[model samples]
Target: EYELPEDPRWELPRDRLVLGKPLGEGCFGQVVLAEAIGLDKDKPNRVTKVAVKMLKSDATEKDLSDLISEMEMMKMIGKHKNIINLLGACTQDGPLYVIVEYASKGNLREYLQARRPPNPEEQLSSKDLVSCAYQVARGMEYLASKKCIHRDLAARNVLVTEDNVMKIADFGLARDIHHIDYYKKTTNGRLPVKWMAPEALFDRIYTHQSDVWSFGVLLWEIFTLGGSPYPGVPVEELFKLLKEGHRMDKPSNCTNELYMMMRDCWHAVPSQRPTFKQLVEDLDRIVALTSNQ
Candidate 1:
């Protein structure tokens, strides 16, 4: 095992960079949007924006393990354009505190739900939608190519840049394809019920194929501009049906091609879920099929 950092501390540049207000907070920690301050005299007065995640200073053993796992995984698998790049992890204090490139536009979930939807006619252009879909698929394919499984693939973790470029983030739930069976025991409460596959919900071992199921659900979220996972279905009802093989209802705005793509992702049998490569290919087909008249 790699030696985990001890006594890691975060120090802002000597120039007094002010970490701004918290933009988001969740189970792990709060993310603050910050402004870079104090540059060298020779350096131009350019401002840099960043998102900093301050996790528990006193982390549990499992939590620390998860944090280290993510750091190691990213070090091995982070060069792709579709994957969010890790800037660096803090080492001045104990426990892991990492810094990464801030997705200025916020995550897909926030972007999609930031405001009420406009008319359907004002939907994202075909080119833009396809571009986003293609990027998401490419990122997933890259992860699977490395035999890495991103157990949690959701809009909340998909980062969007100012240019609308989508990148995958949050690898705390990731695991190697070989160690997937071990993940079964960890998935029960760890898996996000609403975003999980039926088999995943039952504590069954999930493979890259199971991730495919997640991708389909993610696509539905994308196509619908972040619609609720299951419209009008409460958590209890959704869980009841899922335990019996029922799946999320695709929104009306989802294109037929998009719907079919997602359907393949949720194939009842984990092995039956299409591989990420196939997903990329089919996504390309969908893009072409819907291209200009």
Candidate 2:
């Protein structure tokens, strides 16, 4: 039922991809470290180490189409410094391979934890941590400008490079925001309920503001050096607690100002949450002030 128009503009030939070590999966089935030969224009003769994202081993037709659908979302997103870059894709060949730039340091979650003990070098400063959140906001700003809703916006979903640029990834549940400004959840399993906004958890409705709620939790993760959100709260009790105005405590090192912003993000009314543009401006100010220290 391939209805997508035949276009090789973004499609990669299967022969070009050379799979290497087994990199763990996130949103994809198998995120293997692979090499795409002759794809890099600057180094046409060399191999570009990339993460080849594809469907699960038992991928159904629907699942393959899910990967294809994500490609459509990425096509609209194009490229941003903080957003993950899609190098190319091999859709019609064997299984499937959505080639993307490899984030050498891996996801933000484990990266922060690995450096949590803070012996010395590679340990993050407050400014560094805050800027990590800021970068995601900037990246989300671009995604919002394109009228896209990234349902999953967590530190685990965000990738970090060798230079520590936060590249947003894991577009498993993303969708193009329409005129109505909302998309009702009609499908899926394995929900990210903890990071989800109230309306999302309760009404099964998703809007751009829902992304803000997850961003707030993401900020929490950064300040805590990747501490798990809502430590002891079970999934069943979390929504109820949130309904009664419950929120996680701020990390000791987080500024009151930053925590306030996170609180605003968890506002009961989805419309009350700061837009990505607003978060960008607010963080923009904070980053400047603390950057020197």
Candidate 3:
């Protein structure tokens, strides 16, 4: 049998990743807290806390193979301050394990849920919400620069650090498109209905611009402090409503400028949407304006 090529970028000894408490669960399997041993050259015994994600013990060979392939592509994506950095991974014959930097405060949705006001009309301060959007936009800008389509960019997918920094995580639905700018849906996999662009929902087309549309919904989440999109509307009705040119009402506490930006993203035509770089610049300006106010 021929040997698979070694990837120096993300190879780690399986023994070094000492798995710990269960953190959360996803489609593949559970993610647990882990202590990575022998990281520092100066202190070989030094341990660093991380999150180790692995497939379920009963996962099929296809699942294992997919995870391995994803890990390989992720390594090529490389390190970025706004993106969750992959530390290393264990790709043996058993369950696949991938380790990443730990975010102490959990995800953005959970963080917002804990802090949002009880009154639906009231929301977080503009400064806080805009800052969060700015960070997410910056992260998306980085991903866009890398020609990656984060098909599932939502508040739930973003992790928050102890210092309240936003780091884009959960690449389970992400795909790299270095040669092509768009992807046509090939399989009927589970998709985030509420955050999907009209083209994605209807034509099965996904592009970086589609990610911008999802970011708009994420902006809604930020302003509403984790409120569910189309709260009481059923998915079928929501789809019809969107097709009929309906959009979520401007959030009670959201600024007109920010809301307008959100509307720009929800345009029916994907090409009409702003690039992540433009979103970043606009958000930066908005945050600066809000800060000065």
Candidate 4:
């Protein structure tokens, strides 16, 4: 039962412990590396720690709402093992700090980047790819079941643990889908342009179906091991590129079936996007196929 700060000006804890370096930066602030006290201690694995996202010093009212929104979303999701856990938060001071379970293995994007191949022999095994996608889809399915829409579902937001569990984080853009009017106003036309569906890009109303469309884009990003959404193009050009039917390049290590799934995710029609359940089923089939590789 984390209490919301009365005002965004609540002071942050200064003497609090922070572990290693920062993990990453977001619009609001830095995600510092921090260890958990009295949590799981005996693994020599301090990174079984968590991410502390601290708000910037000069944050505004909207900025404050964004932080609160993130906290609210985390409060709803923290209990789930596959979702990043919020151990605690401090907003008593200058910057608000959010404590979340960390992944020693880092994010899915980092893992993918770390394992990229210079030559054919260095590529990730097909089985690993299937396992990765299944875990991600499993997390998505769970979020959907909870009636939460992770509007920003990208590889960067998917954290892979030391044990290879894929957990979803960064609910800054997520909204409660059941509130039809609120969701429509909130979800419309705002998301990463590269991962957005054609309808969403055009300012049309969004649904879980649109999220599935973005999920397809994420699938492509995973297969390519976090390749730039459009390796050679700028944002202004991406809409034209997508409009012209230009697609993401196939990864050198991908197979025919895997590529097919990626294509399916990017299907021009939102209705044609695969449900998370169907994506999980297909990922399972792909994983089975990799057993012989």
Highest lDDT against the true fold, candidate: 2
Encode model 2's per-residue lDDT on 1-293: one tens digit a residue. 33444458776778888887767543333678888988865666788888887766777887777777777778777888988888888767366678888888988887888887634447787788878889999998888887778867887789988789999986534443433222332132223567888887777788889999999999988998978776566666776798689988878988999999999998999888899999999998898888535
List, residue by residue over 227-253, the lDDT tens digit for candidate 1: 667555555676788768876666676
What TM-score, to 2 decimals, does candidate 4 have?
Answer: 0.76
- Give the per-residue lDDT digits (tens) of candidate 4, residues 74-110: 6665467677877666765445676677787767777
- For model 4, name the residue pairs that clash: 10-92, 10-93, 11-92, 11-93, 11-94, 12-93, 12-94, 50-102
Evaluation by lDDT, superior candidate among 3 and 4: 3
User: What TM-score would candidate 3 get against the native?
Assistant: 0.85
| Segments in model 3 whose C-alpha atoms lie over 4 Å from true places | 1-5, 25-29, 40-42, 92-95, 119-124, 172-191
Models 1 onward score TM values of: 0.75, 0.86, 0.85, 0.76
- Which order, best to worst by lDDT? 2, 3, 4, 1
Error of 3 at 230 (Å): 0.4
Please, what are the lDDT tens digits per residue for candidate 3 over residues 106-221? Answer: 78887888787643423456798899999999988988887788867888889988778899986534344433222332122223577889887777788888999999999998
TM-score ranking, best first: 2, 3, 4, 1
Residue 252 accuracy (lDDT) in model 3? 84
Candidate 2 vs candidate 4: the TM-score winner is 2
RMSD of 1: 5.9
Q: How accurate is candidate 2 locally (lDDT)?
A: 0.79
Runs in model 1 with CA error above 4 Å? 1-18, 25-29, 35-47, 57-66, 93-96, 115-123, 174-191, 232-236
lDDT of 1 at 211: 80
